[PDB]
Amino acid sequence: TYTMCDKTKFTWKRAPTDSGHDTVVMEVTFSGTKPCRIPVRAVAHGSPDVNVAMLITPNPTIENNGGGFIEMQLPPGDNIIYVGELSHQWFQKG
Amino acid sequence: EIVMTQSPATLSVSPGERATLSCWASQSVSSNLAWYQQKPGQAPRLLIYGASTRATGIPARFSASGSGTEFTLTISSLQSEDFAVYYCQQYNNWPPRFGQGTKVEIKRTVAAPSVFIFPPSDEQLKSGTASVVCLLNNFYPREAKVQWKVDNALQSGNSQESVTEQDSKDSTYSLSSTLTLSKADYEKHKVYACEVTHQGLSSPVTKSFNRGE
Amino acid sequence: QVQLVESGGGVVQPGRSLRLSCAASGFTFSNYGMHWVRQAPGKGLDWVAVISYDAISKSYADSVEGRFTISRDNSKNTLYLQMNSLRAEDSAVYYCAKSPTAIDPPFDYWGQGTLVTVSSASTKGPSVFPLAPSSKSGGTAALGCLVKDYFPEPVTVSWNSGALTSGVHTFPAVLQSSGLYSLSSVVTVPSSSLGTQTYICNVNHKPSNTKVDKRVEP
Ligand code: NA
Ligand code: NA
């Protein structure tokens, strides 16, 4: 029911980091029109067509006042997390 | 939804002076506030986005500021092309919402209208209807009152009015008003008069004609 | 470079349907959100709908939700607005508006707009009558043309085929109780010119294919 957040208006509030409990966590700041559903994905390097972000937060959103937290699992190897156009490389251990 | 209010509704300033326009949001819209200019008969144009950033090709005499619930647009040294309608728009929250606009008009001295009256043409009269046209030419300010009298009786409900945009050359307005009678009713009366009240007239001005004469 | 051309406007009867389109050129259409904004005659700007660059996201103003559908063809660089169940209060100039980003406002470029008139009235060309100059209209005489009982808007007027522009006032039309419009157009000229120069108003009503030139004589 929400539109997708404008993919040009994200920056990192807390960059991708290890959560302890075998997941990857991150926070984003969004400066555009709210509320909206956060477009999030990830790819294995050299495999741009296949999303590999397995979302633990399955419907991340920016609300009128809050939102921005994303948790995912990723496969081992060199990955890139995208939140809209915002990216961050994430190497995942086996 | 967010209610956007602009103040004042109309602003009269002389050329070269500064115009300050206000925009109010019913709740905070951070800095996601835009300003648009719209000239008569044209599409709007983006002036300001992000509350204070000038859009491309916008000259430097336009500046804006604000965040949260109060925003102002300032035009320094008004040039004749700057006179137009200005709208704010919040785009912090769906649905994006325009304010109702602020008309910026050229302020000048008081100018009384020139009044002209036009009887119905003979071509219209053979069609069964009769329109009498009153013209108020080149007056300021915009407020003017026109009363129709037929054989000295004040008319009501049979006339419509229209006002031009401010003249770019002399900053005046003009007004046309049409009185419409059936041909039969038109031929039952003699004196058709247009009575004009306006701030530059010491007392109301009547222009009239006698049907046939 | 950037251009947005709307089309599809016109008269439509209440309860029926209209599709507007907007053809884009001069920019990579498929990278940007597109919006529809509307403006009723003499009123303020009124946001209608948005569609994201990739058509995945749409949102509508409440006054049109469930009746309008926005869509886009990115291989044809075209934006559409499908309008169902039209009401008189939907009558407006409709603008397509480009976003500088993927979906959000503001609106960095605007089309010229297309006029939607929701009405039962039949198209009709105006009758053009002369507003003759007289003494009742010092060195100045007023004359003009009365452009009466036409539908729909717009009509254009010129004087002497565009050669007489100074001192000309063409007023906004008034909508009469009949559902037809009337407008007048006037010129002030030196009163000594009446006896030498011809004054002829040119009235063009594209909707009904009417073209009229009335000579206005004293
Ligand atoms: Na957004
Ligand atoms: Na709006």
- Flag if C129 and B131 touch (Cβ within 8 Å): yes
Residue of C nearest to B123 (CA): C129
Sign of the alpha-carbon torsion through C131, C134, C136, C139 = positive
Q: B44: cis peptide before it, omega within 30°?
A: no
The CATH number of domain B114-210, selected from 3.40.190.10, 2.60.40.10, 2.60.120.620, 3.20.20.70: 2.60.40.10
Helix (H, G, I), strand (E, B) or coil at A41: strand
| Ligand sitting nearest the alpha carbon of C45 | 2
- Domain C3-118: which CATH class? mainly beta
| DSSP letter for each residue of C138-185 | --EEEEEEEEEEEBSS--EEEETTTTB-TTEEEPPPEE-TTS-EEEEE
A34 Cβ contact list (under 8 Å, min separation 6): A62, A63, A64, B92, B93, B94
Residues with beta carbon < 5 A to ion ligand 2? B 97-98; C 47
Contacts of C1 by beta carbon, 8 Å cutoff, 6+ apart: C26, C27
Q: Do C108 and B55 touch (CB under 8 A)?
A: yes
Break chain C into its structural domains and give their ranges. 3-118, 127-216
Q: Answer whether C50 touches A (CB < 8 Å).
A: yes
Q: Which residues of A touch C102 (CB under 8 A)?
A: 6-8, 84
Domain regions of chain B by residue span: 4-106, 114-210
How many angstroms separate the CA atoms of B72 and B119, rounded? Answer: 50
The sign of the dihedral angle between the CA atoms of B37, B42, B43, B45 is: negative
State the method: X-ray
Question: Which H helix or E strand runs over B13?
Answer: strand B10-13
Give the residue from C101, C107, C108 with the most A CB atoms within 10 Å of its CB, the best one to mutate.
Answer: C101
* B4-106 and B114-210 have identical folds: yes
CA dist C53 → A31, A78, B191, C77, C106 (Å):
18, 29, 65, 11, 14
CATH class of the domain at C127-216:
mainly beta
Concatenate the DSSP letters of all residues of C16-48 into one string: --EEEEEEEESS-GGGS-EEEEEE-TTS-EEEE
A88: β partners: A81
Cβ pair C153, C142 in contact under 8 A: no
Half-sphere exposure of residue C145: CA atoms within 13 angstroms, side-chain side: 24
Torsion of CA B166, B59, B101, B90, to 10 degrees: 170
Please report all neighbours of B, defined by 3+ CB atom pairs within 8 A. A, C
CATH 2.60.40.10 fits B4-106, yes or no: yes
Q: Residue C57: phi, psi to the nearest 5?
A: -115, 130
Please state the domain extents for chain A.
1-94
Size of interface B-C (CB pairs under 8 A): 133
3-state SS, residue A76: coil
Please, what sign has the CA dihedral across residues C74, C78, C79, C81?
A: negative
As a whole number of Å, the end-to-end CA separation of chain B is 63
DSSP code of C206?
G
Cβ of residue B92 closer than 8 Å to a chain A Cβ: yes
Suggest the residue from B1, B92, B97 to mutate for an interface test with chain A (most A CBs closer than 10 A).
B92
CA–CA dist C7, C20 (Å, integer): 6
Residue B87 to residue B102: CA distance in whole angstroms: 7
Using CA atoms, how far residue C115 sits from A50, C9, C86, C178, in Å, is 46, 5, 14, 20
Query: Which residue of A9, A34, A61 is the best one to mutate when testing the B interface, meaning the one whose CB has the most B CBs within 10 A?
Result: A34
Residues of B whose CB is below 8 A from C110: 43-45
